[PDB]
Paper text:
The autosomal dominant monogenetic disease neurofibromatosis type 1 (NF1) affects approximately one in 3,000 individuals and is caused by mutations in the NF1 tumour suppressor gene, leading to dysfunction in the protein neurofibromin (Nf1). The ubiquitous Nf1 isoform-2 splice variant Nf1-23a (2839aa) is, together with Nf1 isoform 1, which lacks the 23a insertion (2818aa), one of the two biologically relevant alternative Nf1 isoforms. Our high-resolution single particle cryo-electron microscopy (EM) structures reveal the domain organization and structural details of the full-length Nf1-23a isoform 2 dimer.
The resulting dimer is connected in the centre, forming a core that buries almost 3,000 Å2 of surface area. The Nf1 HEAT/ARM dimer framework is rigid in its core, providing a stable platform for the GRD-Sec14-PH domain rearrangement while retaining high mobility at the peripheral tips of the two lobes. The disordered, S-rich region branching out from C-HEAT helix α103 and returning into the core at C-HEAT helix α104 could not be traced. Flexibility and solvent access are consistent with the reported target for phosphorylation.
Residue numbers in the entry:
A (entry chain N): 4 to 455, 482 to 620, 674 to 795, 831 to 853, 887 to 1121, 1134 to 1191, 1845 to 1953
B (entry chain F): 1954 to 2458, 2601 to 2745
Write the structure that this text describes.
């Protein structure tokens, strides 16, 4: 129930992926839509009827579909091609069930749609050629079983034509005989049926049956060779009788010379079928039985010898005789019948007609019928293979080119199509190898010269292509009788390879270049390696094979070619195919040699496998990466032990393995892929000849490409980016005054300020992007020194800034480079940040921005520089500082000047609301700078150091306080909330480092007016007390009043912070109270906290008197500042002290 | 300072006069804001040192606050004033504000309500809680004597009320612990005090803010207190109120129990834990739909001894809870009295006698609860099951017998009621024990919480290691008994996948030498078909289809019972899938089906209904959004009733 409905899905998905049907991009790289086909083919074996019927309707629907346009036609052509190919595989795949009860589908559903293509179908000169070729194979497979169905249709058409007397030209039904599979018994039926009805047919019908019946003979002979032999082995009267009756009818039909020309090819086939009539023809002739036959046979020879003055018959006699010669080959000749004798009579005459160099036999438009000559020569070879005498005629150099063209193609069929075993084989021709090679050399010499008469030149290219395909089919044919290397001259196997190699990078003759690749790839199989030099097969291979690599690799690097991505896919397999010969060679005998060429050619392979990583084509880069395994796996074979050599012969062995994994990833745009390549390119630790010359060679290309982009007043640019990214990530290898690496930087820095109207903007956007996020961590110490020196000359003598519009563009870029550079944490960077001193550059950077002025533009620079100084204080442990503290003070000096509040209201422009952000940004810089910083005053004037600091501390304290008062909400809520929070955190860090010099100035924060700010100063003060265990140990009484005053507050988060301060005091100073106190966070302390305070104060006063004087002095001072309600409290706990 | 005599003036109606004077004094305090620090020290500080007068003074505080309301100023101020009153006699105001709370809660039984907040007496409870918050600081709630009665109320209030009342309960706990660390009446060794201080820090972590229900609150103190509490009354809003989960209450309830026991180690012959238990045991077994569920989750979490007579009551509160659900239209009300009865049993079994029948008959309560199809009831059912196996091991009951033998032997006396349930649930326990006990454990994979998924995987391993150990078969052998638990563990346990590998890539699952029974191989295919019908994951669908292709060939005859289960999802995959890894095995399935066609189907799709398991694929569906009792719960009530009658006669 369900499974039938499961198949429908497999069928239904088939329709929706036919190009004419909307593609919808469901191919999924064609892997998903191709898998469905295989299922459809497999299912057909058990549900043959269902699948086939489904397929016909898909074909019928496509036929009755009208579409216009160049896209439209191409889609439907490719659409119908897939259906037919699939449909044939189902028929062939199906086991020989031989169920002949498929009549229902064949008669109506299937035959009419297959028959449609077999018509001329002149819509496409190239398309219809394939459809007939593909469709015919379907009809042949179908005819195997259901012969009666096809055969019945033909019988009807004959009867219709027979009775009717108005001649019609719709003979296409008749012409199906050319394709239906035929057997001996079936063939008899065709002859008998046509014999009865032949006489009454019209003229046109008679010709079609004759031609089609003629081609029917060859299908039987090829497909059933054995049955043909038995025909002559044992007599069969029935076969002879039917042919004889048909023979006479055809002869009666043909009277004119034009008619005789048409029918002669067939008549010989019929005569061949009746053997004994030939014998009698040789001897005395019967009155009528063998009278008509003998007249015809001798009439043939006259024209074959040129005696008659009729050209048309001369051409026809040629065709007829050739078929007789071809048919003879199948007869074993053990019978030695007259067939062999009859051919011998005509062979000598035939050759002089077809193989006379003086006179070229020209059947028609072509200068000579090239196909016909191939049939003759191939057949004659099989009859008399021992010493052919016309092989030499063609093989001779003086003979015309077409004779050469016929010779190789003739040798091409011998190798590829030899069904019968007892025939001779190609081995007999090996003796002529020496002459074959010379022909290759001369044709190669003249073919290349022409590219760099009209048809003579074109002739050579066709001959050259055929020669290359020959080496592809069989390489031993041309390698026999090797010359062996002369003392002063190269060998013969070498000269062959050098000729084949120089065709690969041509691109003048793309078809040949593709073929020479396959030819050179077959001479590398383990079988064919031996033949190069049988004396020593493991010494000439590396001498030549390696020397081929050196030639091809040097070509790829030199310049870009259209087919570069295709030579690379071939070059991968050469590497696969020369590892195996090294693997097996080493196993049998290590002894494997490494002459200088093996080194001088191993380098150039690497110098070309780097330079393909920055190639724009995604496929080229992916393939290049996978070619690194085959460079690695060769290392193991030469030396198995890892440590001894695998990291000594190939120093960067470990990273190369990483290239492989990344290649095995889903495809993504060139930008995403370049990120992964540049990561791996950055881990090449060890200098090598391959690295240090892939860097220099691609630098010279980079330098010249730049001039073209700039000087000339998108694909051109994208390459410029890729060469730059590559040439930065891989800088470290070539490292180690004037040098190629240093000149890269200078030119690189002279492009951050590149003012070019045409494309200037895109250059700067990318040089900033790369030098920051992609430079190699081995070049920081050199980037900083050059970046510093460029700046230092912005200041004239006596330290006066020289504003210039470009100088302002350079500083804005040096900030974005530095920020990205520092912000990113990567492997190995840390060790290198240390070498250089970044201080002197940072100090000079602010002064220039300090003098820039005020405007919407210059303010945003001030913002970003402040964010850089924040990031430079998260990496302070990594960096190197000559004088850390003396440098952090000046920055605080230079940054406080920019924090100016309420300047956007006086400016009266909301456009300058940014100034709020500059104050927000400046403080975050000053928090980070101050965290842990002792104060140190510049010794420009002579004052006591201790006094000097206290003056300094008050300078910043008042500054923060003033900015704090403005931020009060009563005097944007988020802005003020954050800025106020920062301004207290900035103040806390200032006090912690400098308790000794700044505690006195700071006590006034205890009674500040902002409740949220009083809690923080108390937490800071709790922290300071515990770290230890006016100095903080000399004012126990001054703090104790702050704790007790703020315990009665009205802010629930200011009571708890005050409870904790009280706890620190008793432990730190051993104050004795009644109960116990335990520091904590999260307590909910009640508001009516009055009798608690009075109880602590009463106790301390009783048995802690020495605090009295300093306690009361503060309590009175705290009375005035507090409010009315808190004033009543201060009375309550003050009295116990009096 | 002289009202002592008048307060008990022979009830001559002069007593009515003093209360008027106090009510007048209360009004000065509300209005004279500026003189507040000085009224407290003089009027209330000193008036609160007269023992005989404390009872009447306190009473007026509550009455004045009552009229204002929970957020009213009059009630807000009287909460603060009690701090000064209580400083004179901590031992007397504490044991009189606590004693009123414990009684208001005890009167909610009379007119039970779906929740406290809808009760009439709610407003009385809310204000009395603000008194407890304020008195807790500095040990003015005498913990050294009232710790039992403070935890008892904390557990009945956690995560109830407006967000102001929820930050108050958190603060109250932080103050009871702090008072312990800084109390002199108790003498805690230096070992104990380290335990307390870690507890003090833990409770302030973002973990416990979530348990109390005040996540998204930066600090609790701020929300608990309001600055302008004298000028204006509180203005509650955002009535949207989070829910509470009885699993949260255990995590808190055991955090407190850890604290208390540390103290009892030092305090000799302490009675704290025996007093707290008595308070819980009184609300646990008394009908009050607002307090009963919480008083069961607490009764079991702290109790140290349980008897048969107690267990019968717990299991008969579960029988009446089910009956109400189907009778009435109010469901959620009584679907939390069930989840609480199950959570108690998970804790009280490990205390039962070593030789009691119920140690084994609590495997059918766990099973009969998974059959109710609710995410919470399912989650609680496994936790009772998982520990039922763990407990029986430590009692060494699976030594010479197999799971099927133990649990199916005790079910025999009450087989008649059990038989009918199996008919409707569509699984059978007489036919095949180990396949009906995995139908219930395949729904676990559909639970929203990723923590109940891993608990059902552990319950599979622990069952697997017990069936094989009965046969001494290395814990990964494949047999008729131990094949169900390996199909379930196939897609989650790597050691199962490697040690049981598909033949057409040790021993290979699907062996036809041992799995030579038509029935035992019809079931094993429904388990594999089911696991993919609802699964949605590439890694799972890959592994499960490769085992179904190989099943198509090795078991040609019985495979047609797996079409409708595979029918729909494959049909969709064929049309639209674009994965070579996942599209290969599906093709292998289609080809095998057509090949082995051309024969009259020997086994139809309804082959499983014949011998019981017609519901196996249905019981593993997703949990229904339309939460309702499956309505064959009328039989679970009779089963539970017979279980009690047979094993707890009286």
């Amino acid at each position: 129930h369900r499974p039938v409905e499961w198949v429908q899905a497999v069928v239904s998905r088939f329709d929706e992926q036919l190009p004419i049907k909307t593609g919808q991009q469901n191919t999924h790289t064609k892997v998903s839509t191709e898998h469905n086909k295989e299922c459809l083919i497999n299912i057909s074996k058990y549900k043959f009827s269902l699948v086939i019927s489904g397929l016909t309707t898909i074909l019928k629907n496509v036929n009755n579909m009208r579409i216009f346009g160049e896209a439209a036609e191409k889609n439907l052509y490719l659409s119908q091609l897939i259906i037919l190919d699939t449909l044939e595989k189902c028929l062939a795949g199906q086991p020989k069930d031989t169920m002949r009860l498929d009549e229902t589908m064949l008669v109506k559903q299937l035959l009419p749609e297959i028959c449609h293509f077999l018509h001329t179908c002149r819509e496409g000169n190239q398309h219809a050629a394939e459809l007939r070729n593909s469709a015919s194979g379907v009809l042949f497979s179908l005819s195997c079983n259901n012969f009666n169905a096809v055969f019945s249709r033909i019988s009807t058409r004959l009867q219709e034509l027979t009775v009717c007397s108005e001649d019609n030209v719709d003979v296409h039904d008749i012409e199906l005989l050319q394709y239906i599979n035929v057997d001996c018994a079936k063939l008899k039926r065709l002859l008998k049926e046509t014999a009865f009805k032949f006489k009454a047919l019209k003229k046109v019908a008679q010709l079609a049956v004759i031609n089609s019946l003629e081609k029917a003979f060859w299908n039987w002979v090829e497909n059933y060779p054995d049955e043909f032999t038995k025909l002559y082995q044992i007599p069969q009267t029935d076969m002879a009788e039917c042919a004889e009756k048909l023979f006479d009818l055809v002869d009666g039909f043909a009277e004119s010379t034009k008619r005789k020309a048409a029918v002669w090819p067939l008549q010989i086939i019929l005569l061949i079928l009746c053997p004994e009539i030939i014998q009698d023809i040789s001897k005395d002739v019967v009155d009528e039985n063998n009278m008509n036959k003998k007249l015809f046979l001798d009439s043939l020879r006259k024209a074959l010898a040129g005696h008659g003055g009729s050209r048309q018959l001369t051409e026809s006699a040629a065709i007829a005789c050739v078929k007789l010669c071809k048919a003879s080959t199948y007869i074993n000749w053990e019978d030695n019948s007259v067939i062999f004798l009859l051919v011998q009579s005509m062979v000598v005459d035939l050759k002089n007609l077809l193989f006379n160099p003086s006179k070229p036999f020209s059947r028609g438009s072509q200068p000579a019928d090239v196909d016909l000559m191939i049939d003759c020569l191939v057949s004659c070879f099989r009859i008399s293979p021992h010493n052919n005498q016309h092989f030499k005629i063609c093989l001779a150099q003086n003979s015309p080119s077409t004779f050469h063209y016929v010779l190789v193609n003739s040798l091409h069929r011998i190798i590829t199509n030899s069904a019968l075993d007892w025939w001779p084989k190609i081995d007999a021709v090996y003796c002529h190898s020496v002459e074959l090679r010379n022909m290759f050399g001369e044709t190669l010499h003249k073919a290349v010269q022409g590219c760099g008469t009209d048809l003579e030149t074109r002739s050579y290219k066709y001959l050259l292509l055929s020669m290359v395909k020959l080496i592809h089919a069989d390489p031993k044919l041309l390698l026999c009788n090797p010359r062996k290397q002369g003392p002063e001259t190269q060998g013969s196997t070498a000269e062959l390879i050098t000729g084949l190699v120089q065709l690969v990078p041509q691109s003048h003759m793309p078809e040949i270049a593709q073929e020479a690749m396959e030819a050179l790839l077959v001479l590398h199989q383990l079988d064919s390696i031996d033949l190069w030099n049988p004396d020593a097969p493991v010494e000439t291979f590396w001498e030549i094979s390696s020397q081929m690599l050196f030639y091809i690799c040097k070509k790829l690097t030199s310049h870009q070619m259209l087919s570069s991505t295709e030579i690379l896919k071939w070059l991968r397999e050469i590497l696969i195919c020369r590892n195996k010969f090294l693997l097996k060679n080493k196993q049998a005998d290590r002894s494997s040699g490494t002459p200088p060429i093996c080194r001088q050619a191993q380098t150039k392979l690497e110098v070309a496998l780097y330079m393909f990583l920055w190639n724009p084509d995604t496929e080229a880069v992916l393939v290049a990466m996978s070619c690194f395994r085959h460079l690695c796996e060769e290392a193991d074979i030469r030396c198995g032990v890892d440590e001894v050599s695998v990291h000594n012969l190939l120093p960067n062995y470990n990273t190369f393995m990483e290239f492989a994994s990344v290649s095995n990833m889903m495809s993504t745009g060139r930008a995403a892929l370049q990120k992964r390549v540049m990561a791996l390119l950055r881990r090449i630790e060890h200098p090598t000849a391959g690295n240090t010359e892939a860097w220099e060679d691609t630098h010279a290309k980079w330098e010249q490409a730049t001039k073209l982009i700039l000087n000339y007043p998108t694909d051109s640019l994208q390459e410029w980016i890729n060469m730059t990214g590559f040439l930065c990530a891989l800088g470290g290898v070539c490292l180690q005054a004037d040098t190629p690496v240093s000149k890269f930087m200078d030119r690189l820095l002279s492009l951050m300020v590149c003012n070019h109207e045409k494309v200037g903007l895109q250059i700067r956007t990318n040089v900033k992007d790369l030098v920051g996020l992609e430079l190699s961590p081995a070049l920081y110490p050199m980037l900083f020194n050059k970046l510093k020196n460029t700046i230092s000359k912005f200041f004239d003598s006596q330290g006066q800034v020289l504003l210039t519009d470009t100088n302002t563009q350079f500083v804005e870029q040096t900030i974005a480079i530095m920020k990205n550079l520092l912000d990113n944490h990567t492997e190995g960077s840390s060790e290198h940040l240390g070498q250089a001193s970044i201080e002197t550059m940072m100090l000079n950077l602010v002064r220039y921005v300090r003098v820039l002025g005020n405007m919407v533009h210059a303010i945003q620079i001030k913002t970003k520089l402040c964010q850089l100084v924040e990031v430079m204080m998260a990496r302070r442990d990594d960096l190197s500082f000559c004088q850390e503290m003396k440098f952090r003070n000046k920055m605080v000096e230079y940054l406080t000047d920019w924090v100016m509040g309420t300047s956007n209201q006086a400016a009266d422009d909301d456009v300058k609301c940014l100034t709020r952000d500059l104050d927000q940004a400046s403080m975050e810089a000053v928090v980070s700078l101050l965290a842990g910083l002792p104060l140190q005053p510049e010794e420009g004037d002579g004052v006591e150091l201790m006094e000097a600091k206290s003056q300094l501390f008050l300078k910043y304290f008042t500054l923060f306080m003033n900015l704090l008062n403005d931020c009060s909400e009563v005097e944007m809520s988020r802005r003020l909330a954050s800025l106020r929070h920062c301004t207290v955190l900035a103040m806390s860090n200032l006090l912690n480092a400098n308790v000794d010099s700044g505690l006195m100035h700071s006590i006034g924060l205890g009674y500040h007016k902002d409740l949220q700010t009083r809690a923080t100063f108390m937490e800071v003060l709790t922290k300071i007390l515990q770290q230890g265990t006016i100095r903080p140990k000399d004012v126990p009484g001054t703090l104790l009043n702050i704790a007790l005053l703020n315990l009665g507050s009205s802010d629930p988060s200011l009571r708890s912070a005050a409870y904790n301060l009280l706890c620190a005091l008793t432990c730190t100073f051993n104050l004795k109270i009644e109960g116990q106190l335990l520091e904590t966070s999260g307590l909910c302390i009640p508001a009516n906290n009055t009798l608690f305070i009075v109880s602590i104060s009463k106790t301390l006063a009783a048995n802690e008197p020495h605090l009295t004087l300093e306690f009361l002095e503060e309590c009175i001072s705290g009375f005035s500042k507090s409010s009315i309600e808190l004033k009543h409290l201060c009375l309550e706990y003050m009295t116990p002290w009096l």
